[PDB]
Amino acid sequence: MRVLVTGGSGYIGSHTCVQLLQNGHDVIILDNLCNSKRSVLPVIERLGGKHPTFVEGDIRNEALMTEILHDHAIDTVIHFAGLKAVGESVQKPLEYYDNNVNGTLRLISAMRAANVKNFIFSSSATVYGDQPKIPYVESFPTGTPQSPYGKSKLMVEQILTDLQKAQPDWSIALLRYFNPVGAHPSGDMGEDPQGIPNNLMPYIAQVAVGRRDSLAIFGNDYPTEDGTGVRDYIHVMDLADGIVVAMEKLANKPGVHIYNLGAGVGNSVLDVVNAFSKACGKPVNYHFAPRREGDLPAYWADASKADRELNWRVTRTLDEMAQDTWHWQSRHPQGYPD
């Protein structure tokens, strides 16, 4: 199929695009490069075995979206573009609602004008919020997300659900990713954000290669076993495989198809730090810090729905995620060329 991958030079997107190209799909990447490096493109192409088209631009530019969709006869859209830092969103709400809500609205408006009716949305475990039972299950209601990032993702889910009710030929996947970590097994593609990483694992990896002095751990007084936050860590390669399976299986199947994509087990921040220390051979330096706004104490997935319906499940462990990120970072301590 001919796939538009917004945010496709980013972390999840770059891994997804490799898998898409390996499966014979045609890939067009749209990215504004605010949180990724252009030089990942040829790495995607070498690992994927096929050339992806690149367009530098912004999902908020509806005119450009419409041009792309038409110029390439796109079949399906995988949407990764947006801003993703929970704590940052509390400080910069308008930027998150603009990139995430308006940006998705602009993209789906261009899709409706171009008659493209297959959408795979990068949602988040943060749409559940504080109320729902853990592990999270898709058949029980969401609650109140705890940050503008989380709220933005739930607002887009709702907008997309109401679009599909009005326009019932659409197929829309709401894929609630949990916490992807890890890197491609070659060690030549991994996470490389712009500036200081907001996510846990790339920060730890940059400490381990000597770029940053110490990890700050955001909270040690949570109601968790060791007092640090607990999350469901999923290897980015398993995540990317799930996304591709969803895209293929759900294209042209009308409805709103909701899946948790996670490993189904929780690990704490200190668990991740310990996993990485064993992979790299040295204790990763850290210090405790206050809780980050927008963080819940603990959550993890029930990913049985994706197992039953998509025949997908995780295959890699947290230790293997830490090993693959260390393999990447140690090979490329400054990330991609710039």
Added chain:
Amino acid sequence: MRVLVTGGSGYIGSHTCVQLLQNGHDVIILDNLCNSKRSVLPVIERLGGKHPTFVEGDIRNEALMTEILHDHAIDTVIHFAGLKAVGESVQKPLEYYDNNVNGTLRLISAMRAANVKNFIFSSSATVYGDQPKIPYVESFPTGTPQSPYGKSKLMVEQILTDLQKAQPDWSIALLRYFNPVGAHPSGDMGEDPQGIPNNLMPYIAQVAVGRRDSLAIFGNDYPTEDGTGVRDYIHVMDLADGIVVAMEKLANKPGVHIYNLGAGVGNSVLDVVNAFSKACGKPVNYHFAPRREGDLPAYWADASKADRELNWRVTRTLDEMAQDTWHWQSRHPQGYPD
């Protein structure tokens, strides 16, 4: 004050602008004329006793909004612009989320650029959604809104609330209007949408002057006394006064200020029809149609908060609302000229 009134040529806006101008404010009206007529402008000037400035344009045009804000040295913004039909929103969700959510986002992004920090938002009783506690009280939670229109308004409430947490010098009023009806007592300004009215009272009035054959009452099997929907009808002049009071009292008061603006009693569709037949002297032709998607059976306000805090409450009765609408419509059967 120097007041920007988006949507100011519209129903509630035009009445509000007349009250603003009578209080000596400088008023700039911004409207795209999708649901109002430009020929209302001299009426607003005459009844207001003072000339407002008019700009034809769209709240989604951020650059234009910023220009108006700077040029006119705006102190506070009253935001009426948007789309407002519950049933239409179910059919046309994208247009609702764009005009309502992106439109408000573009406006408040302009205000951040121009350092304007006083906002009065037209919210709606539809944000309460399926909250079973009725009359609705501000200090009790919102439920799930039951249409894209209602969800759009609550999404904007949430965005504004997050903005004010990040930028705590903002003063933001979330004014949850109930169901405004009626017309200026002169009989020369009233409700005149483009096309076929979506709201109950302007449809009634256009049947009463012979422009429409029969009112469609949407549902006759609700769990109410007569089976028709129940709402809290508030005279538009009372609502205009309340908006003006809120603007004047809440300017430069940092915080998020939530008020229901309603009469605090419920009346059914048939109650309104009977009040109109009494006012016009002829029984209004009607029939029953199916329930309209998005509609709840019954709701009305607790408007005690506005009484205690803003010293505002309703003064006009349902019969006066119907008499004033008939006065307008019988004087001006075709509304304002095109």
